[PDB]
From a paper:
The deubiquitinase CYLD in complex with SPATA2 is recruited to receptor signaling complexes by the ubiquitin ligase LUBAC and regulates Met1- and Lys63-linked polyubiquitin and receptor signaling outcomes. Upstream of its C-terminal catalytic domain, CYLD harbors three cytoskeleton-associated protein glycine-rich (CAP-Gly1/2/3) domains, which are ∼70-aa SRC homology 3 (SH3)-fold protein interaction domains known to bind to microtubules (Yan et al., 2015). Here, we report that the CAP-Gly2 and CAP-Gly3 of CYLD are novel UBDs and demonstrate that CAP-Gly3 is indispensable for full CYLD catalytic activity in vitro and for CYLD-regulated NOD2 signaling in cells. CAP-Gly domains comprise a five-strand β sheet topology and show similarities to SH3 domains; a subset of SH3 domains binds Ub (Stamenova et al., 2007).
A detailed understanding of how CYLD CAP-Gly domains bind Ub came from two crystal structures of the CAP-Gly3 domain bound to Ub determined at 1.7 and 1.9 Å resolution. To obtain crystals, we slightly extended the CAP-Gly domains C-terminally; crystal form 1 (aa 467–552, 1.7 Å) crystallized in the tetragonal space group P41212 and crystal form 2 (aa 467–565, 1.9 Å) crystallized in the orthorhombic space group P212121. Also, the Ub binding mode between the two structures is highly similar, with hydrophobic CAP-Gly3 residues Leu475 and Val487 engaging the Ile44 patch of Ub. In addition, hydrogen bonds are formed between CAP-Gly3 Arg488 and Glu507 with Ub Glu51 and Arg42, respectively. Chemical shift perturbation mapping of CAP-Gly3 bound to 3-fold molar excess of Ub revealed a comparable Ub interface in solution studies as compared to the crystal structures. Residues from CAP-Gly3 that engage with Ub are conserved among CYLD orthologs, whereas Val551 is less well conserved. Mutation of Leu475 to either Pro (as in non-Ub binding CAP-Gly1) but also Arg (representative of CAP-Gly2 and most other CAP-Gly domains) abrogated Ub binding without significantly perturbing the structure of the CAP-Gly domain. Importantly, CAP-Gly3 L475P was still able to bind to the NEMO ZnF domain. Hence, while our data reveal CYLD CAP-Gly2 and CAP-Gly3 to be novel UBDs, they interact with the Ub Ile44 patch distinctly, through either a central Leu475 (CAP-Gly3) or through a central Phe288 (CAP-Gly2). Additionally, Ub-binding interfaces in either domain do not overlap with known binding sites for tubulin (CAP-Gly2) or NEMO (CAP-Gly3), and the interactions may co-exist or potentially even cooperate.
Numbering used by the authors: 467 to 479, 482 to 552
The structure:
Amino acid sequence: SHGLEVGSLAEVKPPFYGVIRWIGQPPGLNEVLAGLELEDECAGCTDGTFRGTRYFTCALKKALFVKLKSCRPDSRFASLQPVS
């Protein structure tokens, strides 16, 4: 959504911020998910696994899986203009 890819800085509007580490469609779902690596550990978060299956690897308790169509480029950085 909006040309998000792995490595993109994303936002899921209290907005959450994470870097997309994985995009795909787990078995059982009919929608594409983004697996986000968040900056800090979070309660309902894994180390890159979703419903038991591993999709990427990150530090303990930093992986959050959401619907890709719920993601937007991280607005904190979207307005950043370059040097001249």
